[PDB]
Design a protein around this ligand. Structure first.
Ligand SMILES: *[C@@H]1O[C@H](CO)[C@@H](O)[C@H](O)[C@H]1NC(C)=O
Ligand SMILES: *[C@@H]1O[C@H](CO)[C@@H](O)[C@H](O)[C@H]1NC(C)=O
Lengths: 438, 438
């Protein structure tokens, strides 16, 4: 058989539904969202980390001349000076008032520790969802996993069940993000080849060990100092450490709907929001002919007690008469309240007690046992404890919290003087005619 | 110095512009789009190719029983039969009217040739552009390459020149595409894990040699035939060959703007459309003080001849008087027409001939030599040849094809009888007053 139904996005909340077919008992279908897996599409842009500068041995020409060449090293720079007398422990290596010249150069490369301290800039897009479901029909359980896209059915027993699309798309990921040491930070990094001294992503590389590298961090060389050979240099602090000191808090502590986010897939998990439609195909073998199912007689509904609460705090009682033995499912045809158990042993004249919960204190609804059903009305009270994190609001409110007493007061309240007004107008017309008699 | 200017997207079309500074000769700047490189962002979804089925040696139980197990092979299926008498050249291996049983199984894997015949489904998005430019300022040439994004300046001589964003985004790539043997076909492939027998992408794999594989192509086993052991099977033709017979023509022959598309970067090249703004910084050293530049006197414009055409079919002549020797640039301050050369040797009283082209046959405009300028008016005729692919329409039309004669006819055409109407009304008022005199 075939059926369809919509379920809200939420993990570990069984929903119980019925499929009705004349001549066959209505099977109880249990649907649970075991887990959620939102996986977007990712693109790698470039890596970055703390950098180490290079101060190579200088190129000193004793009583000659030199120049400022070019090279492919990232942040490569050169500069030359003349009339320099460098010294050293053995003495002065060379002195020529003008002919001496010194040439210095500088570049940079990722530090050796970068291999593990590196962060990466990611371009993300097109959030896609993967959902794991547990579906039980007639004590026939099945574990399945599928995308929410309406095209693909996940394979479980070769039963193709379609679902989606998502009611409303939610994505804590911004189009641009950064990843570091298992943490994901929402940030707007600059484009590849776009750098700013003292800013994040001052150094770039397609790979952690790629030979090609590019950066720009305001490295201007300084003139040689007094009498001692060295290379006085200058450069702005790494943007990596700066951004680290002020990167902001991780997205782990800011995502809505309690997302659980992991890096190696760059995905979210157990993050719930929205609703999903589902199409379900069922073999007719699983179905049971009604005559095989037991029949019931003169069943009554009795509310032992019920306090409005969050857990299955509502309790009900049922007295039934039957001509057969076996099992029947039970269902709450009214959405406002939902049971906790599916079926139970039956009896010729036995009675049972049932658990349930509701979104309103007004326990007025109808409930079905076997194929028959009976009404159930009562009042439930709010609880004392008002703070718990266990599953709650399994059903959303439908402005049905309005008590029957409030409806009674409202109905008798609204006036109907307009009828008196019309009667007054009619008698006015008749009296006007009578006066016209004169 | 700094300047800005917008240029249309087109390859190999030098544009000549001027930067004006009092006390400095206006340098001639030449801008050419050497090439274009549009590179989008790509995501790999799954591979596919022709498949080969597997018919393993059957599992035959001589006078016993068997079952239909499960396995992880793609399209794995099993089926069993009983009461079978298989035969073979040495005779009948076993016969038991009922106790004999036969079990067959079937699956599939990518064919060995797939390694080179494989096609891949790609998810593309976020088209990005890379542009190569050649810029010449004062016989100072520079070859640069940069993105059109307004943030990143390409590096060439360490001269940061920004450009973009694109005036209008164009992308022949659909969000979904397929690649095969160096060809790119625009197609809407199904999602990973979504298959249909006889349809494209019936077999999937994250890698060409990934052990994991999934497919569904309607493989139902057939009952054993008469007296001869074998495995009669059935299955639908590969969607790969079907799509090949009807894949449609390559995108190479359908993309607009003459895109040249390559696969290993999945990029387009030399595909022109739209306009791009550009910001250009220039060292003041390149600039030349005006006094250093030669001065000119009483220069006249003379049109030797001009036929409206596509190439530099317009010819002009200039007679000048100068007090200095050297060089000056020339420019067409009117967009409708553009020169072909930048500068020339100067003389105290010499004269020169110049080439140019235009988008209108009306050669009315002003042209600047050194810092001074002179007007130039004339009429150009359409050409005889009307079919050529060489660069043309270097300037877009600005409804200026309207000839001066047409304007003359239009001006004298439109009437002004409303003035006669007002005069008639005024004389009517005066005559009405005179009649009121009576
Ligand atoms: C499921 O219930 C049916 C009767 O409703 C019973 O015949 C069957 O054995 C049950 N299956 C399991 C696995 O309990
Ligand atoms: C460029 O032109 C200037 C004068 O306009 C000249 O001094 C210089 O040598 C030229 N450079 C080259 C490379 O021709």
């Amino acid at each position: 058989f075939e059926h369809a139904t919509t379920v809200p996005n939420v993990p570990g909340i069984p929903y119980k539904a019925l499929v009705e077919r004349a001549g066959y008992a209505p099977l109880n279908l249990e649907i649970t969202v075991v887990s959620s897996e939102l996986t977007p599409s990712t693109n790698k842009e470039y890596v970055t980390c703390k950098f180490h500068t290079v101060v190579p041995s200088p190129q000193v020409k004793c009583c000659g001349s030199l120049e400022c060449k070019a090279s492919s090293k990232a942040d490569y720079t050169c500069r030359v000076f003349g009339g320099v007398y460098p010294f050293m422990w053995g003495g002065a290596q060379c002195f020529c008032d003008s002919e001496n010249t010194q040439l210095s150069e500088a570049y940079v490369e990722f530090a050796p520790d970068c291999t593990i301290d590196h962060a990466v800039a990611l371009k993300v897009h097109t959030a896609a969802l993967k959902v794991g479901l547990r579906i039980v029909y007639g004590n026939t359980t099945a574990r399945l996993d599928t995308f929410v896209n309406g095209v693909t059915p996940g394979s479980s027993r070769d039963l193709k069940v379609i679902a989606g699309p998502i009611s409303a798309a939610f994505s804590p990921f911004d189009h641009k993000v950064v990843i570091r040491k298992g943490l994901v930070y929402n940030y707007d990094f600059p484009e590849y080849g776009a750098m700013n001294p003292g800013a994040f992503g001052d150094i770039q590389a397609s790979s952690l060990d790629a030979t090609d590298i590019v950066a720009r961090t305001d490295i201007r060389l300084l003139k040689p100092s007094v009498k001692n050979i060295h290379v006085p240099y200058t450069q702005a602090v790494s943007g990596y450490e700066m951004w680290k000191n002020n990167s902001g808090r991780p997205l782990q502590e800011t995502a809505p709907f309690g997302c659980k986010i992991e890096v190696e897939p760059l995905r979210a998990t157990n993050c719930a929001y929205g609703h999903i439609p589902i199409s379900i195909d069922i073999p007719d073998a699983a179905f049971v002919r009604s005559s095989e199912s037991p029949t019931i007689l003169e069943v009554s509904c009795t509310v032992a007690d019920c306090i409005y609460s969050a857990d299955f705090g509502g309790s009900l009682t049922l007295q039934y008469k039957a001509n057969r033995e076996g099992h029947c499912p039970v269902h709450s045809h009214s959405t406002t309240a939902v049971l906790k158990e599916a079926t139970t042993h039956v009896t010729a004249t036995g009675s049972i007690t049932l658990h349930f919960s509701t979104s309103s204190p007004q326990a007025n609804f109808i409930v079905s046992l076997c194929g028959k059903k009976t009404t159930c009305n009562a009042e439930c009270k709010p609880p004392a404890d008002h703070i718990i994190g266990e599953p709650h609001k399994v059903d959303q409110e439908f402005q049905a919290a309005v008590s029957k007493t409030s409806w009674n007061w409202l109905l008798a309240l609204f006036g109907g003087a307009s009828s008196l007004i019309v009667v007054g107008l009619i008698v006015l017309v008749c009296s006007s005619m009578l006066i016209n008699t004169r």
